[PDB]
Swiss-Prot record, chain A:
Active site positions, chain numbering: 41, 145
Protein's recorded name: 3C-like proteinase nsp5
Location of this chain's protein in the cell: Host cytoplasm; Host Golgi apparatus; Host nucleus
Catalytic function, reaction form: TSAVLQ-|-SGFRK-NH2 and SGVTFQ-|-GKFKK the two peptides corresponding to the two self-cleavage sites of the SARS 3C-like proteinase are the two most reactive peptide substrates. The enzyme exhibits a strong preference for substrates containing Gln at P1 position and Leu at P2 position
Length: 301, 305
C-alpha cells in the first residue's frame, strides 16, 4: 500500500553524466557509447544568445575547443556535429557504463525522471511530467543545462528530455535527445512565454483510480456523464480535453476498480465543483496530474 | 527555479541490491563488502511470524538455506548471524561496487531517499521523512522488505533505514542498519498501530523559506513571535515543538531571504489559525514537512554527488 511520486533509479543515467566545457561556458553532457550529447548553446557567449547563428559559431570551433570531463578523466574529442539543438561530440573512448538505451520523444502528460546535474555531477533525482504547454515544472539552477529526463521501463533507459532553458515564469524548456524542442521554444534569449498551463485530465483520472485501489472512495458519486458534457465543464477549470484515446487508456483501471471512466469523470466534475472540503486524496489536498495511467498500474499493481 | 521533492542519486545504492531467499520467502538484501544485510523475518514462514523465536529459527538454518542472488550470479553464503532485527549473511565475494558507506540512525523529522526494490531489483526512488511517530509514509508492496533508506554526504552513502513492514493504516516501519526498529514496533504478525503523528515544524519553516527563494511571498507578514508563544500555538495544532537548535539550523535560510526565523514563525502561526484561503505555496495546498533545512539549502544551491 501507499502511493508516492516515485522516480526511476538514476544509476544507469549517473554513469553517463559528463562535464562539457567550451570556452567559459560549462554544462552537462550525456556520454553514450563514443558520443557526448549536450545543448548546442554551450558554444555561445551570453552576447551571442539573442540571435545566435549556431552553424556559423560551430564551424569556427575545433575539437580542442571542447573539454569533456568524465569524473577525473579528460575525454579526447575527435569530432563534433550538430543535430537540431543538440551538439554531438565524438570522443575517443566508448563509455563502459553505457546502459541499454533508446531516444524517445514523449507527448504532453507523459512523465519521466530527471537527474539534475551540475558540472557533470548528479545532485538529485525527481519525477516530472511534460505539461500540455510543453514545459516542465523542474528544479533547475544555472549549470543544470544538459541534465536529462528518462524512463527505465525494464533494463532499457529511454532518454526523452535534455534541459536547455528556464522561461521567465520559472518553468523549463528543453529538447528530445535528437535536439528537437518540446513546444514552440527556441534556444535564444528572445522573449519567450509558455502557453496557458492546463491540468492533465487523463492523469488526474488515473490518480483518482489509484485512490480507489488504495481504499479511498469518499469522492465517488452515483453520477455518470457524457464525454462532451465532461469536457465542457473540465475546460472551464483549465483542464485538458479528455479524448476517446484517454478513455481507452483508462480501461484497465476502470475494469480493475469496477468504476466506468465516465462515472469517474462525474466524480472529477464534482471535485472541481466542491473542492475537497478539508479531505485529502492519497495525502494530497490538490488533484495530482503527474501520474499517468501506466505509472498507476506500475506502482499499485 | 523550481522546487521538487528530490531524492539523492540512487546509483551507489543500486550496485548493492541483491535478492535473498530463504525457503519460500524472497526479499531484498544490501550487499556491502562480503556481507549481505536483510530483515531477519526472511527465515520465517507466515505461521512463524505469529510468535517467532528468531534464535531458534536461525539456529536451524544452514548457509545453503540462504540463496543470495546478485543480478544473475548466485553468491555463496559462508556464514550467517543476527544483529537485532537484521540478518547478516557472510558471502564468499566482496561487492566490487561497494561505495564509501556508514550506518547511521536518524532522528524523526530527518529525511532520506528510499530505493524501493523487488527481488533484488531496484524499481524506484523516492524521498521521505522519518515521521515523529517513527513510521515512514512509503510506497511499498510485498517483496519490498529489505529496501533501504539513505542519504549522501559528498561521496559517502549513509544507510539509515531498512524496510521491514506495513502497519494496518498503510504506513511503514523498519530498522536502522544495525536492526534496531524506529519506533515502538516489533517484527511479528501482531496488532500494532502507529501513534498519532505530528507535523515536523522545522521542515515546514524550511519549505516556507524555499517558497520565498522561489518567489512565492504572499504568506509573509510584518509580524514576529516569541519562540514560547509559537510553541504554545504549534502544540495546539499537533505541530512538533520548535527548539532553539531548529532556529539556529534555519539561520542560513533566514540570512539568505532576509526573513528572521521568528518572523517566518508568525507566518506559519497565521497559516495554522487561518489556512491558505484558496492559495498554494510551491503548488501545494498543504504545508509540506518532508524537506529539512539542509535539503532546501542543498537543492537551492545545487550541491552535487
Ligand atoms: C545552463 C543555464 C542556462 O543556460 N539557463 C538558461 O535558461 C539560459 C539563460 C539565458 O537565457 C537563455 C536563453 C536560451 C537558452 Cl537555450 C538558455 C538560456 C538555465 C537553465 N535552467 C535553469 C536556469 C536557472 C537560472 C538561470 C539559468 C538557467
Ligand atoms: C516483504 C513483505 C512483508 O513481509 N511485509 C509485511 O509487512 C509482513 C506482512 C505480515 O505481517 C508482518 C508482520 C511483521 C513484519 Cl516484520 C512483517 C510482516 C510487507 C512489507 N511492506 C509492505 C507490504 C505490503 C503488503 C504486504 C506485505 C508487506
Ligand atoms: Ca548487483
Ligand atoms: Cl532548429
Ligand atoms: Cl477558463
Ligand atoms: Cl497538496
Ligand atoms: Cl490541481
Ligand atoms: Cl509523537
Amino acid at each position: 500500500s501507499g502511493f508516492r511520486k516515485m522516480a526511476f533509479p538514476s544509476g544507469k543515467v549517473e554513469g553517463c553524466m559528463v562535464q562539457v566545457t567550451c570556452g567559459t561556458t560549462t554544462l552537462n553532457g550525456l556520454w553514450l557509447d563514443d558520443v557526448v550529447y549536450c545543448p548546442r548553446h554551450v558554444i555561445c557567449t551570453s552576447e551571442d544568445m539573442l540571435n545566435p547563428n549556431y552553424e556559423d559559431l560551430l564551424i569556427r570551433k575545433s575539437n580542442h575547443n571542447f573539454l569533456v570531463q568524465a569524473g577525473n578523466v579528460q575525454l579526447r574529442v575527435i569530432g563534433h556535429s550538430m543535430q537540431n539543438c543538440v551538439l554531438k561530440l565524438k570522443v575517443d573512448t566508448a563509455n563502459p557504463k553505457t546502459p541499454k538505451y533508446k531516444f524517445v520523444r514523449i507527448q504532453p502528460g507523459q512523465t519521466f525522471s530527471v537527474l539534475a546535474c551540475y558540472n557533470g555531477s548528479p545532485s538529485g533525482v525527481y519525477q516530472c511530467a511534460m505539461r500540455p504547454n510543453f514545459t516542465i515544472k523542474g528544479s533547475f539552477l544555472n549549470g543544470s543545462c544538459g541534465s536529462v529526463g528518462f524512463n527505465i521501463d525494464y533494463d532499457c533507459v529511454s532518454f526523452c528530455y535534455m534541459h536547455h532553458m528556464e522561461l521567465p515564469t520559472g518553468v523549463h524548456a528543453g529538447t528530445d535527445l535528437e535536439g528537437n524542442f518540446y513546444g514552440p521554444f527556441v534556444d535564444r534569449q528572445t522573449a519567450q512565454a509558455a502557453g496557458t498551463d492546463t491540468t492533465i485530465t487523463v492523469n488526474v483520472l488515473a490518480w483518482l483510480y489509484a485512490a480507489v485501489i488504495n481504499g479511498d472512495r469518499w469522492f465517488l458519486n452515483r453520477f455518470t456523464t457524457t464525454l462532451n458534457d465532461f469536457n465542457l465543464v473540465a475546460m472551464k477549470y483549465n483542464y485538458e480535453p479528455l479524448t476517446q484515446d484517454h478513455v481507452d487508456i483508462l480501461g484497465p483501471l476502470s475494469a480493475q476498480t469496477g468504476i466506468a471512466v465516465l462515472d469517474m469523470c462525474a466524480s472529477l466534475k464534482e471535485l472541481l465543483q466542491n473542492g475537497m472540503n478539508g479531505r485529502t486524496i492519497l495525502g494530497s489536498a490538490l488533484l495530482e496530474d503527474e501520474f499517468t495511467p501506466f505509472d498507476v498500474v506500475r506502482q499499485c499493481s
